Design a protein around this ligand. Structure first.
Ligand SMILES: [Zn+2]
Lengths: 83, 129, 56, 217, 25, 221, 132, 71, 101
RNA sequence: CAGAUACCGUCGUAGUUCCGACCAUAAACGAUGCCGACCGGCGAUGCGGCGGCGUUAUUCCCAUGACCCGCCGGGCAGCUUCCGGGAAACCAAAGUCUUUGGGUUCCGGGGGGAGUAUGGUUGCAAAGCUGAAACUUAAAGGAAUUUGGCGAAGGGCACCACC
RNA sequence: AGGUCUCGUAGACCGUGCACCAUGAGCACGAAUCCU
């Protein structure tokens, strides 16, 4: 995104999907941004640490987006590993 | 019948990355195929791959990332020199800043910048960007 | 809350045409037309012909 | 959503799940729901693993409680099985209910007087409510769905494996989502059983309503 | 005309041309 | 002559708590109010007609002609838009076309030809836009070359800010609407092309809605 | 053919909506009610309003209607919705459990429960309608 | 192209020659018929002697006579 | 243009079927293309049943039926109104019309 | 019927049938060459093979045939689909194509003249294969939409229609 | 011992053709925009 001097020349850096690793377009209204809450370890209380994920529109209209969110929650470690 | 294993291999990995898969199988193996994926793995366009060493011809499990755009094969293998490589790079790469030409010279199989540095030519295999 | 103007005559050509500009509400039947709208017709004489005005 | 110990099925929710007929589902099988199914029982009935229902239920509960504005989550039901359940869910968790005749244009048509534009959609069935899922594609709207073994999987983010046919299962799962969202909200207790009435979220046919009002006072 | 009967009248013209060719020798 | 928004994006831009349109393009939020971009992009946003064409519908009595208007919007340093509208009169058609084109505006990035010196000037890669049978292909060009094309993608690339192009077209180019829409699609597809200069994992910045939930509840129901 | 127009039905619906406590079954009494409360430029229109209001009162007296929601049948729908039984209807003393469901429940979290019982399975796999 | 062999130049050449012969302009410019039946014979201007002056009519959608000569 | 996915018939991998004749017409039609009518009806429908049963030698007698197969050409099927044309989206329906009486 | 050497009806010649010798032509169509790979699902169908609660060949066992539940390979097919493509109709191939290359054969450059004249060739003949030019023309076409028109169909209406 | 078993009765899917029915002179037609 650079030049030879070093100054940032592009106007923004677009997002990429967490499942297909494709660039989310500015007019792709099928794309999502979802927030999932992190809980305290012993109490079971919501404190506010957030770990958001984005899915591009093609994966969502494919029918395999829930599996993508399931694999992201497997990778982060919040949902149980035995499953 | 099957007359080019490398063209079918790169077509299969192109279809797999275009659909959005993560692992693919390539039915035949060759040393030239392993060199081709080694070039793309050194350049970071594909992930860490595997060799299913079965006694027929190795099956290759390639880990796919989203960094690949298109993998293509030029058939037949055209003779290319140092003076004629710029035309291929102009009409076959999408841009001058990225993309690589995989050509087989006598000192191995790698990208065209390294063959420019060693000042050698040969036969072209394909491209990726 | 409702209006209608109609022009007809020579509008840039030999054959006469009619342009209608309607905006709002317009009652066409019954006695409320007799006491909710006012209709005036005038003739405009131009150089190339005569032009008509109808306002409601 | 299950890595801890308090986020586990303790004693009685297993009994509620077995009483409401949760474990038995539809005859046919969707290919996206293959990970959620153990093994086909005889006479063409598929068996849903209750662990996966629990973990996807906690994932949906986390997704609901993540937003701080309860008016920005909308629950959807156009079938007679879940009319009162979504209304009482919106009464308990502060959501916004849509029950019967989801009009085509609440999400996209701007000058329509019923323009409700939420941040989160929670629906009880994808097949009977394909029209909210279609209009959830033209706007950046994540969806929560309760998915059966037969229902298609499309424009979904968290699919809770369920049996959305009987009234007992639908009402029990709506009560479980309400209980989990209120438990991570903090307006209700955790150790004390808050269970005042479990039958509050069950739709019943009106013939049972006249039979009950003639049997009782 | 359609192609079938135009083809047939062309074949009849061919026939008449062939007999006048053979009898004009 | 005041602005009364109907969506929460219009109010959240109206109260000067959205700094620019860049995060709207980043979070891929749909735009339904045309005065947001008029609030952001002001004096540098210019427009001109491209073609007005008539279409006819056959009825019992005579023929009914409705006029379809094309227009291009975009400032000379970035974003560009296009819109199609048809109406019975010409003034209503051009006003609806200007409003609908101003509503739907894409962003475009610019790249370099070989050497990354100075400000970017050309398309960073080979992009292709297609609708109908119309094909258009954009090639990166050296500096100072100038736009070589047909007049209508020359106009669209002047409103796109790119001054260096090599073009190649195929098909029925006489249809101005499909040619303009194909060039607009070729311009808008420049972001769905992952070059290795952005292979790093992005950091997820904060969404506007959840950040200003308190202000939305404080302002409107 | 005497079919009422949409303005008659809409006006009758809203006048039976906002005013119910001063209506009856006699056509003349609610005719005078519609004359006194609603301003109507004619007499035949008011008369048709009165007739359709009388018909709607006679149907509301029998059962509920899906177009008018008056105050008195309201609170009754949420009384039926807020009805609760003193039993829980899922806390039954014995629960009939499939053997496949039991070999699920033995391996998930539990080993033995004294509240569940087993049932025999069927002998034949006949579960599809004969189609071909 | 269809034939993509490394040692195929002849089939490409002969097929290109045959499909170039299956044309109109290349068929016109390379045969002796289109120049032998040409009144000018590959010439731009020519001289001649007029013998009769004949006025030929116009086509369908317009009505005139056209002044011509026989040369 | 292509009106139907098949050709109004039931030939997929054959290339030739045995031709048959029409009943209303005498037209040579292929067997898989013709409209078939396997009709079941009584000798006496609803008026002479009581007259036959009240003038019969035998009590508790069943009435025999007529079992014939009708082979129809396309024009003879339309002209007798056996089958009628449908919409483009409603052409794809392949179920028979439901029976009630 | 104005005409009817036509639609309709009664007769009726070659032919329709088999043997033997010929010609090599169809809307010979799936209007879609052959081989090879990849790329969604669903329920059935014909063959071969495998596994499994149960019923029948009259009550026990085994294998076989006859049903039920699932798979494997090949074949004719069907339903849905913002995978993808196309001018669209539509296509799981007519996809993997400007991000243009797996191998290979035949074949088309606007509409008429024209599958025509001539030359060669096959044949008893009818004809088959190869196959132009002069001249003329600014359109001839493909898909789809909106109107009108049907001696097209399905519902309603009118004493300027009928009974 | 009782003496008409009970619950409501589309209980028309009766048919197929259908005499003659041809033609139409053209001139009458022209596509667009913003405020001081
Ligand atoms: Zn017939």
């Amino acid at each position: 995104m650079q030049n030879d001097a070093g100054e940032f020349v592009d106007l923004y850096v677009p997002r990429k999907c967490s499942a297909s690793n494709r660039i989310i377009g500015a007019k792709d209204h099928a794309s999502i941004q979802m927030n999932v809450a992190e809980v305290d370890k012993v109490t079971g209380r919501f404190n506010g640490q957030f770990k958001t994920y984005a899915i591009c529109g093609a994966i969502r209209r494919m029918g395999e987006s829930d599996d993508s969110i399931l694999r992201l929650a497997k990778a982060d470690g919040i949902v149980s590993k035995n499953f | 019948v099957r007359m080019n294993v490398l063209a079918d291999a790169l077509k299969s990995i192109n279809n797999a990355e275009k659909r959005g898969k993560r692992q693919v199988l390539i039915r035949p193996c060759s040393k030239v195929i392993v060199r081709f994926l080694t070039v793309m793995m050194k350049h970071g366009y594909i992930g860490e791959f595997e060799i299913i060493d079965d006694h027929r011809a190795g099956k290759i499990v390639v880990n796919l990332t989203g960094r690949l755009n298109k993998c293509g094969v030029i058939s037949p293998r055209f003779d290319v020199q140092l003076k004629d490589l710029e035309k291929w790079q102009n009409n076959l790469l999408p841009s001058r800043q990225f993309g690589f030409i995989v050509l087989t010279t006598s000192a191995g199989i790698m990208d065209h910048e390294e063959a420019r540095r060693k000042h050698t030519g040969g036969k072209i295999l394909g491209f990726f960007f | 809350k409702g209006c209608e103007v109609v022009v007809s005559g020579k509008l840039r050509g030999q054959r006469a045409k009619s342009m209608k500009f309607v905006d709002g509400l317009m009652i066409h039947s019954g006695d409320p037309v007799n006491y909710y709208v006012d209709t005036a017709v005038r003739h405009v004489l131009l150089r190339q012909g005569v032009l008509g005005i109808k306002v409601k | 959503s299950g890595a801890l110990d308090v986020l586990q099925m303790k004693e009685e929710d297993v009994l509620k799940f077995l009483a409401a007929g949760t474990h038995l589902g539809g005859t046919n099988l969707d290919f996206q729901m293959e990970q959620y199914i153990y093994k086909r029982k005889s006479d063409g009935i598929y068996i849903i693993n209750l662990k996966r229902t629990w973990e996807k239920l906690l994932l949906a509960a986390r997704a609901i409680v993540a937003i701080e504005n309860p008016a920005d989550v909308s629950v959807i039901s156009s079938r007679n099985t879940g009319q009162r359940a979504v209304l009482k869910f919106a009464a308990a968790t502060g959501a916004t209910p849509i029950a019967g005749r989801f009009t085509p244009g609440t999400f996209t048509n701007q000058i329509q007087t019923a323009f409700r534009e939420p941040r989160l959609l929670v629906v009880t069935d994808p097949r009977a409510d394909h029209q909210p899922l279609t209009e959830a594609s033209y706007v950046n709207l994540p969806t929560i769905a309760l998915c059966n073994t037969d229902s298609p999987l499309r424009y979904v983010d968290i699919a809770i494996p369920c049996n959305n046919k009987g009234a007992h299962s639908v009402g029990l799962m709506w009560w479980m989502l309400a209980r989990e969202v209120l438990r991570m909200r903090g307006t209700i207790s955790r150790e004390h059983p808050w269970e005042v009435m479990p039958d509050l979220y069950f739709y019943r046919d009106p013939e049972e309503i006249e039979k009950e009002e003639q049997a009782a006072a | 005309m359609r192609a079938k009967w135009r083809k047939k009248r062309m074949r009849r013209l061919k026939r008449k041309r062939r007999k006048m060719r053979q009898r004009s020798k | 002559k005041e602005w009364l928004p109907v969506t929460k994006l219009g109010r959240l831009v109206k109260d000067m708590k959205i700094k620019s349109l860049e995060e709207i393009y980043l979070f891929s939020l749909p735009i339904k109010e045309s005065e947001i971009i008029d609030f952001f992009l002001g004096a540098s946003l210019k427009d001109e007609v491209l073609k007005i064409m008539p279409v006819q519908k056959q009825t019992r009595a005579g023929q009914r002609t409705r006029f379809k208007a094309f227009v291009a919007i975009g400032d000379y340093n970035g974003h560009v838009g296009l819109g199609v509208k048809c109406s019975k009169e010409v003034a209503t058609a051009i006003r609806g076309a200007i409003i609908l084109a101003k509503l739907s505006i894409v962003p475009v990035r610019r790249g370099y030809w070989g050497n990354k010196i100075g400000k970017p000037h050309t398309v960073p890669c080979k992009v292709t836009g297609r609708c109908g049978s119309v094909l258009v292909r954009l090639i990166p060009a050296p500096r100072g070359t100038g736009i070589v094309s047909a007049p209508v993608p020359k106009k669209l690339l002047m409103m796109a800010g790119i001054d260096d192009c090599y073009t190649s077209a195929r098909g029925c180019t006489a249809t101005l609407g499909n040619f303009a829409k194909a060039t607009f699609d070729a311009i808008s597809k420049t972001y769905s092309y992952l070059t290795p200069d952005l292979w790093k994992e992005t950091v997820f910045t904060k969404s506007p809605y959840q950040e200003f939930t308190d202000h939305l509840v404080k302002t409107h129901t | 053919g005497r079919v009422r127009t949409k303005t008659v039905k809409k006006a009758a619906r809203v006048i039976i909506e906002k005013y119910y406590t001063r209506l009856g079954n006699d056509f003349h009494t609610n005719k005078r009610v519609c004359e006194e409360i609603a301003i109507i430029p004619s007499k035949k229109l008011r008369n048709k309003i009165a007739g359709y209001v009388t018909h709607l009162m006679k149907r509301i007296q029998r059962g509920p209607v899906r177009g008018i929601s008056i105050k008195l049948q309201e609170e009754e729908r949420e009384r039926r919705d807020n009805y609760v039984p003193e039993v829980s209807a899922l806390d039954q003393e014995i629960i009939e459990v499939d053997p496949d469901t039991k070999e699920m429940l033995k391996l998930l979290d539990f080993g033995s429960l004294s509240n569940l019982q087993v049932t025999q399975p069927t002998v034949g796999m006949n579960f599809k309608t004969p189609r071909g | 192209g269809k034939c993509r062999g490394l040692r195929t130049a002849r089939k490409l050449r002969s097929h290109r020659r045959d499909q170039k012969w299956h044309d109109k302009q290349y068929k016109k410019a390379h045969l002796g018929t289109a120049l032998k039946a040409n009144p000018f014979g590959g010439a731009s201007h020519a001289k001649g002697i007029v013998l009769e002056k004949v006025g030929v009519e116009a086509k369908q959608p317009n009505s005139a006579i056209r002044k011509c000569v026989r040369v | 243009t292509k009106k139907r996915r098949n050709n109004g018939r039931a030939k997929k991998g054959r290339g030739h079927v045995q031709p048959i004749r029409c009943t209303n017409c005498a037209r040579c039609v292929p067997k898989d293309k013709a409209i078939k009518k396997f009709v079941i009806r009584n000798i006496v429908e609803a008026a002479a049943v009581r007259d036959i049963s009240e003038a019969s030698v035998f009590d508790a007698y069943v009435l025999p039926k007529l079992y014939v197969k009708l082979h129809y050409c396309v024009s003879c099927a339309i002209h007798s109104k056996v089958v009628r044309n449908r919409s483009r989206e409603a052409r794809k329906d392949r179920t028979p019309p439901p029976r009630f009486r």
